[PDB]
Design a protein around this ligand. Structure first.
Ligand SMILES: CCCCCCCCCCCCCCCCCC(=O)O
Ligand SMILES: CCCCCCCCCCCCCCCCCC(=O)O
Lengths: 292, 249, 45, 240, 292, 240, 249, 45, 48
């Protein structure tokens, strides 16, 4: 039956590569150390061929370095303030879904060019003093094209088709699983192109790189209230990525980000490696030499 | 068990010979292929102009100087106005193809320097803003920098690839070096990489083709100063669909 | 006795992460060349 | 109903908890999955790709010049060309490498490292270098005589313009912490120094100074453990 | 199937050693009472050989004296104060993980030299008046090398990779299971050595005995708040040790501890045994002698 | 969902509750487990190791001198050498023993005890001792005639310098409480006294006073029950 | 079914004979062994200088007096500057070995006293502070007390082993008595005990070797007063890896 | 009918305590000698 | 301390009143000349 299925669910360990024993070699024509980096291939030299190694039955597990385990970790992707006090008595807010607003999630995602995945969104909402009184909130997901709400009472909150979640602040954080929603085969964190045709002779040219396949609508959030409450609510949106497929790895971003949807670095370029005094100095005192 | 230094690339009516070649990079170990019926989405029968467009195009020659920063091209954009390929890219909405990029740079045995030839998929060009907040025009690069055409565009900050990513890690992309003491060419065969089976050859540029001098060109007085760098490319397995009036851009 | 990797909803994307398919194939990034080079050989001969 | 008792850990939100969640869209079928070239399934495949080491990370050196190890014709014998530590997560030349940047996402690493040096001088320029890797316990060697006592390779410039110096996994613990400095020098890996085995000899009318490019990567037995958050980029405000 | 597995989970009793019947023995050459303690071996004399015993089928269970049962008991290992009032308006605190701060857990652990184990950490947090209002707390584990937070708003709280637990004070105590995290094969409560090379000619010599294999980073705790709350929170950390492996048992500490990471006893040495009047006095009145 | 009802004991935190808890590090594989000599799997193996009894725990005796039972040449016959109670958890000579310190971590104990006496006099010194164990109910015997009525051994000094006096498990209950004193003298074990069977005889020119070292431990049938917290060391403030 | 009083220990080119021996303690019932390939971690081939280093070294002789407190040594530290073993410990980063410690103390049949010879793994030395709080220098022992070298260090408070643990329970460690009326030597074979397969012979001391007089030395006028205590040890199955310049400390 | 010792998470260290492997071998601390001594014999003969 | 680095025996006085110290044949040549002194110290055997 399916008892065999549930038994084979523990994370099975696959170990790192073993090291075989080797000896000295004195001859010509066998040069595993000489390489040709111009070929664009990394060196295939092994330890066994450059030093005399021992037999090491390596048992270090490599399972944690997979793409899934690297990404399936809920990180902050959005902070939404439901302003209902002071000068803005809205009691609602429509947040454009974009996971490129915060550095930690953004840098990890931009390791790859294309990504196809499902997500598990979690909403951590509370007041400014971190308290969570019982206050009914409605988190409505507005897909691209659905009518967006313009008040706390407008008809769009009927949600007769839009998926909606009702939860008080005192409840545990709401959590929903979102499928891979995209007209394309994968989300594209980098789109070297323009969404529409034209001359693209604009002074700003803000449309460059904006692929609508990644734009997945808005998350409309409101307090289910009859009037103004005088309390501001902060909704922190956490996205955990599951069933991941990544393509075309990229260099990890080295310059500080400046804007959400564009690569844009300051003119004061920071070096990837921190500076040192000279090319022959290292800060490692080591031990006392036996006979200097 | 090794690679020969001589090579000849014949596609279409063009043939490229080289006598000091390192190897041929097959990007991600996949050959260019036509769209399988399992992955296609458009129902119009595609056109496959086999030998009229799948051929080598010598496009631009830049002069390598001692203070050069490097240059970059965008693959579909660099061929949109040349030959039968350019016409099919202008007459059809949809397009897909691989390519075989070939960068040529020869110098005497008394010159020195090394280029980094890499093919960067989805090479989104960044603009360097002077720390300005209010979303000024200087926050996004103009069209001349995103689609340089056939003349290419020389790098402003090659250290960050003009994209905020470190140049040192650009070797994660399909790359090859042109080390003047070792070889005089770099060959990269690149399959069609995109999240869609077909796409517009005018709006979207699938690959960026960068040529960056890591070790500067150095020589002594008396040697030939003009050391050119020639970019020759050839589409492979190019298809087009969605015929209509020719659209320039 | 492990009781996990069970999906309680009708839609497959509601299941937990698929962490039982670790695969490693670095050849597509480390050796993306046509002519395979033996280790013990001079690459350009 | 069925009698149950709630245990500690109820109502908590653990960000690394692989559990189920109700789907928002019933009967949703995503876009078909077509083949895209260049899929990677493990970050260890990325750490094995050679990327340029920023060895010349000295004050004043700017731009691409930081990626070059200057080598020239010497007037004396047995001189030091360059040196750097081989701790991948340490602030230094390894910060510019793909292995060095992925290591910063993990707490502990293990396995042999790999540095490939590419000489970019004239075809007429000849030379021999001694690239030595000194295991922990000793500071950077002061003379070539002291450096040759460790793992080293004698590199001969020729038609094969590249050599590979493997840094063997010589450690007491099965893993080393990525963090270094202070009491964490217990996990120091050692120092790689480049010495002139012979001179850098050139004929007349050819440049007497060239560059060596260092490409660092990981070996087949490389491993990472205890994934954490990196410290590479900071943020002070949302990117809106 | 696995029904046989779940059936054989009750704690099976193994009894203490039985006593066999014995009789008087009158002869030479058989001296089970004479021993040689100089050999370093404990005496192998049995009751059967020194007195006349009866047959006792002993049924006393010995399972409670195992290492696991002795250690798998959650004890206090750390008290963390999240100061957010008075002179320190931090709202956060970074506590260095060290289980040697409290005597009861420390003395039990130092029974052995090396220990390899998993742990189940539990956090009991409350205000000073022992109340637990709904207040969202974040307990982030900062492994050695990860960037430590320096404010209640700093970017490190994004936790895009660092494991983090969000829980209100009113919730039941958060509980997580922590694996055996150490570069070594086992944690080493006693390290007769120095972490680095050198002359060790320092005036203090505080590095003696500090093995970095035991230093496992910090636990960063904060209230998820927009500003100061004016309330101090006390987090009591309890560690339950499971899957225990102990090596090289040691004498149990007899002098009072003075510092956390070092054995250091006061100059006024306390005797292991409490004093009595003379060597021939016992405080046991007993009964009335029948015929004195 | 599945109908359940929460029972009493929900949300409680029992410090001795062996349950599951979510893991913080998914896919974590610890360091490989190598063989280390000297593994112990039960505390009963430790209680069977002989350790020195602090019999001379008298006021004024300091340091190592507290571990020695003085024996000398007597001027009279049938004199008392030393005495102590055999309650392991009681404040006294058994506090210095491994069995005595592990017993304080448990509420109740059971099984035979074991005391090994080692004579540390001259090779030329001879003597005979009567070591008697008096079961409960009687105070410490006042004369050797009264002590010999209980479990005793006559010890002869010779080449075999050690003797073992087993304290048999003579009790009414299957277990004895570690706590003693007050109404808990119901669990008293008895008194061990050392008497001069004959004199301590020496030739000329050899020390007339020597020491006996007592090593206490447990027998094979020793057992502990109801693990508790000890009362050996106190603390008034955290060790920061 | 008994143990003979005579014994001879032969390892290397050294041989130790004794005629009044109690037994030979095999610590934790495990013999010294080389690191198995299943437990090793370093990939460098270790060196095993079989007979040049695995041999008996007579290191120090302390005079037992009536008011002596005792002495202690640290096993790797006591041999770091003697013979071929010291050189290999200075030239190599990694080291592992067992040992066979042999303490010799003979006296007439008219002397008396008993020593406690124990081999304490991870013998962390404590400092006795005069109730001072502010983390003064007197809170940690100096290097002379942690690594005494070959001369050893005499105990300050033998009652607490200079470590806050009671001496009476030191018998939980592999130990042996030297009772002058019974035997004149103590032999302890100790395998390599450490949480790591190899370790530095300079920083880390695997074992502490204590010799503490429990019953004080007593004799009458006319007997030999100078009663020495000699410590002879021998590494067993010693390996070294990670060769580099010789490092003293 | 006992329903326990079941692990609900994919990582093995999340399971409860392993309290079914009680082993007692005191010989390594009580008799750590080379020549085994019989009980009824004089140890040093 | 310097003598114990060579071939040695530790002799214990007891009922067996005699001990034997074998001087092993540690030489470079198969034979040694009986004559010694001068350049013939090349055939020296050593010191006990
Ligand atoms: C009930 C409310 C649930 C919320 C539904 C969330 C739906 C989110 C869509 C999936 C997010 C991933 C795609 C994000 C890509 C946009 C990034 C960008 O290019 O700026
Ligand atoms: C989500 C927060 C969870 C907390 C994670 C706790 C991780 C603790 C590591 C394991 C503790 C045992 C090792 C302690 C050794 C240090 C003692 C010392 O030598 O001072």
């Amino acid at each position: 039956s399916a008892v065999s299925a549930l038994a084979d669910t523990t994370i099975s360990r696959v170990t790192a590569a073993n090291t075989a024993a080797s000896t000295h070699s004195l001859g010509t024509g066998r040069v595993p150390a000489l390489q040709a980096a111009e070929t664009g291939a990394s060196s295939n030299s092994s330890d066994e061929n450059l030093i005399e190694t021992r037999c090491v039955m390596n048992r270090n597990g490599v399972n944690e370095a997979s793409v899934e385990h690297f990404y399936s970790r809920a990180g902050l992707v959005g902070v939404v303030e439901v302003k209902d006090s002071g000068t803005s008595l809205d009691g609602y807010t429509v947040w454009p879904i974009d996971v490129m607003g915060f550095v930690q999630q953004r840098r990890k995602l931009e390791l790859s060019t294309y990504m196809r995945f499902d997500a598990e969104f979690t909403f951590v909402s509370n007041l400014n003093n971190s308290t969570t009184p019982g206050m009914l909130l409605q988190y409505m997901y507005v897909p691209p094209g659905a009518p967006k709400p313009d008040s706390r009472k407008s008809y769009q909150w009927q949600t007769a088709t839009n998926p909606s979640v009702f939860a008080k602040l005192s409840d545990p954080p709401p959590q929903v699983s979102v499928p891979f929603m995209s007209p394309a085969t994968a989300y594209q964190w980098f789109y070297d192109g323009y969404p529409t045709f034209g001359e693209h002779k604009q002074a700003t040219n803000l449309q460059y790189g904006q692929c609508p396949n990644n734009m997945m609508g808005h998350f409309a959030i409101r307090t289910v209230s009859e009037s103004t409450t005088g309390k501001n609510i902060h909704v922190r949106v956490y996205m955990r990525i599951k069933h991941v497929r990544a393509w075309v790895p990229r260099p990890l971003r080295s310059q500080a980000y400046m804007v959400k949807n564009y690569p844009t670095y300051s003119q004061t370029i920071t070096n990837t490696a921190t500076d040192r005094a000279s090319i022959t100095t290292t800060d490692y005192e080591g031990g006392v030499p036996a006979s200097p | 068990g090794y690679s020969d230094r001589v090579a000849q690339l014949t596609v279409g009516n063009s043939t490229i010979t080289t006598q000091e070649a390192a190897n041929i990079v097959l990007s991600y170990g996949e050959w260019p292929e036509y769209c399988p019926s399992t992955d296609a989405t458009a129902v119009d029968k595609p056109t496959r102009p086999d030998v009229s467009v799948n051929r080598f195009y010598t496009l631009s020659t830049k002069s390598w100087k001692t203070e050069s920063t490097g240059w970059y091209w965008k693959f579909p954009d660099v061929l949109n106005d040349t030959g039968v390929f350019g016409q099919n890219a202008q007459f059809h909405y949809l397009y897909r193809s691989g390519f075989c990029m070939h960068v040529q740079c020869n110098a005497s045995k008394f010159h020195q320097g090394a280029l980094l030839v890499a093919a960067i998929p989805e090479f989104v060009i960044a603009a360097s803003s002077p720390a300005t907040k209010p979303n000024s025009q200087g926050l996004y690069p103009d069209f001349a920098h995103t689609n340089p055409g056939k003349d290419g565009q020389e790098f402003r900050d090659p250290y960050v690839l003009d994209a905020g990513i470190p140049l040192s890690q650009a070797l994660i992309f399909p790359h090859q070096w042109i080390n003047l003491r070792t070889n005089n060419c770099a060959t990269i065969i690149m399959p069609y990489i995109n999240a869609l089976p077909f796409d517009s050859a005018l709006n979207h540029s699938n690959f960026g083709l960068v040529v960056i001098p890591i070790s500067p060109l150095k020589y002594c007085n008396g040697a030939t100063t003009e050391v050119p760098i020639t970019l020759t490319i050839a589409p492979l397995n190019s298809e087009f669909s969605g015929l209509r009036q020719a659209i320039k851009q | 006795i492990n009781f996990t990797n069970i999906n309680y909803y009708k839609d497959s994307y509601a299941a937990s992460a698929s962490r039982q398919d670790f695969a490693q194939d670095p050849a597509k990034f480390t050796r993306p060349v046509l002519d395979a080079i033996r280790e013990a050989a001079a690459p350009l001969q | 109903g069925f009698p149950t008792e709630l245990k500690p850990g109820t109502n908590q939100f653990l960000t690394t908890d692989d559990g189920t969640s109700p789907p928002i869209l019933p009967g949703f079928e995503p876009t078909p999955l077509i083949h895209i070239p260049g899929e990677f399934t493990s970050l260890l495949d990325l750490c094995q790709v050679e990327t340029i080491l920023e060895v010349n990370n000295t004050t004043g050196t700017t731009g691409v010049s930081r990626l070059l190890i200057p080598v020239r014709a010497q007037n004396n014998v047995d001189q030091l060309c360059a040196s750097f530590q081989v701790d991948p997560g340490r602030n230094g030349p390894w910060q510019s490498t793909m292995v060095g940047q992925i290591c910063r996402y993990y707490t502990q690493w293990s396995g042999s490292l790999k540095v490939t040096f590419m000489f970019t001088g004239s075809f007429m320029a000849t030379g021999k270098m001694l690239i030595a890797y000194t295991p922990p316990g000793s500071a950077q060697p002061t003379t070539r005589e002291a450096a040759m006592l460790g793992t080293h390779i004698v590199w001969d410039f020729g038609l094969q313009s590249s050599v590979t110096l493997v840094i063997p996994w010589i450690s007491n613990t099965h893993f080393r912490a990525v963090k270094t400095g202070g009491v964490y020098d217990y996990y120091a890996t050692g120092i790689v120094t480049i010495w002139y085995q012979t001179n850098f000899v050139v004929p007349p009318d050819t440049p007497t100074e060239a560059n060596i490019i260092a490409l660092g990567a990981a070996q087949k037995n490389f491993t990472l453990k205890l994934c954490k958050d990196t410290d590479e980029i900071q943020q002070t405000a949302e990117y809106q």
